[PDB]
Structures are given as C-alpha cells and as structure tokens.
Amino acid sequence: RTIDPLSRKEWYDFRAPIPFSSKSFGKTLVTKSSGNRIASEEIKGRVVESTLADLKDNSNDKAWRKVKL
RNA sequence: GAUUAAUAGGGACAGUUGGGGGCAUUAGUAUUUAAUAGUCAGAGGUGAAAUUCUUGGAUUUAUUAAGGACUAACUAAUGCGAAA
Ligand SMILES: [Mg+2]
Ligand SMILES: [Mg+2]
Ligand SMILES: [Mg+2]
C-alpha cells in the first residue's frame, strides 16, 4: 500500500429525529476540508435509507418499513 | 262510433353497472440523457467472441432535473364497445 485512499476522510454519526431513537444508527464518510471545501457543508443534502433499526424497543419486527432521512 | 294490448318494437321514468367514447386534470416506477457528489479499471455483449464504450473516468453508487413513451403486479374461460 501507498497512501490509503481514505487518508483524508472524516467520519460522522447519524442522529435520528423525534419519533426515533436518539442513539446514532449509522456512520458516514466525507473528505476533509480543503480551505475551499468546508467539511460540514458537503453533507448538507445527503440522504439516508434505513429500516426501523431506528426505534430501539419496537424495531425488531418491522424490517418492512424503510425511512429516508 | 277508438279490438287486444304480442315472454313484438319505440318512448318515459328509478336505483345501479362497465378497463365504451371526448375533453381537461394527475400520478408512477422504468428506459435514455444531464447535473451534483463518490470511487476506482474495466464495462458491454456472446456458445465463444469481435465491432463498440472507457483515466477527458466509463459501467457502478447516492440525490435531483430534462425529455418523450408506457400503465406492470393485482389481471381472471371476468367486464364494456357495432367492429376495429
Ligand atoms: Mg420524470
Ligand atoms: Mg411524463
Ligand atoms: Mg372487472
């Protein structure tokens, strides 16, 4: 290996809104700020496709409901 | 002084029924393309292959947008229309 391609990558934990569990569900990858590119702002519009893996108690039976965040 | 009133036909009317028609509306993924992000070396296609596309970054992934079509699944020895 020479220079792992993810060298510049920062990770972020997803947080779910009021109906769902406050606990993070997944994590996302983004490139570091370049002085033009602002790290936080490259993520303004991203879209998360999840089950209810997102409601701790009630989740396990509903794999049938997809939620976009 | 006007025959009945055809399980003849025309008309009226009443609750329906239909994927019948004409206008408007309106959705839905899909193909194709574009944009914005990603990532990389292969994608396609075939019996094998080769023409093609690919580092100017394809195929692939996410989110939108444009544009013409088309109405899946439910869908059937079911329906409507004179037939198409
Ligand atoms: Mg469209
Ligand atoms: Mg359309
Ligand atoms: Mg029917």
Side-chain angles (χ1 to χ4, degrees), chain A residues 31-50:
Chain A
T31 322
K32 189 186 176 186
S33 330
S34 166
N36 262 341
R37 316 201 140 223
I38 306 173
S40 56
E41 296 305 78
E42 297 284 335
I43 340 183
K44 244 188 180 183
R46 293 195 181 180
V47 204
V48 169
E49 186 78 316
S50 259

Side-chain angles (χ1 to χ4, degrees), chain A residues 4-55:
Chain A
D4 187 349
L6 303 203
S7 288
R8 247 144 241 194
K9 305 291 184 168
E10 320 176 2
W11 295 68
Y12 294 84
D13 303 330
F14 288 146
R15 290 297 168 115
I18 198 191
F20 311 68
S21 188
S22 156
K23 314 188 144 197
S24 124
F25 49 98
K27 294 172 188 164
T28 223
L29 180 94
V30 120
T31 322
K32 189 186 176 186
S33 330
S34 166
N36 262 341
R37 316 201 140 223
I38 306 173
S40 56
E41 296 305 78
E42 297 284 335
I43 340 183
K44 244 188 180 183
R46 293 195 181 180
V47 204
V48 169
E49 186 78 316
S50 259
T51 359
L52 288 128
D54 317 356
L55 196 55

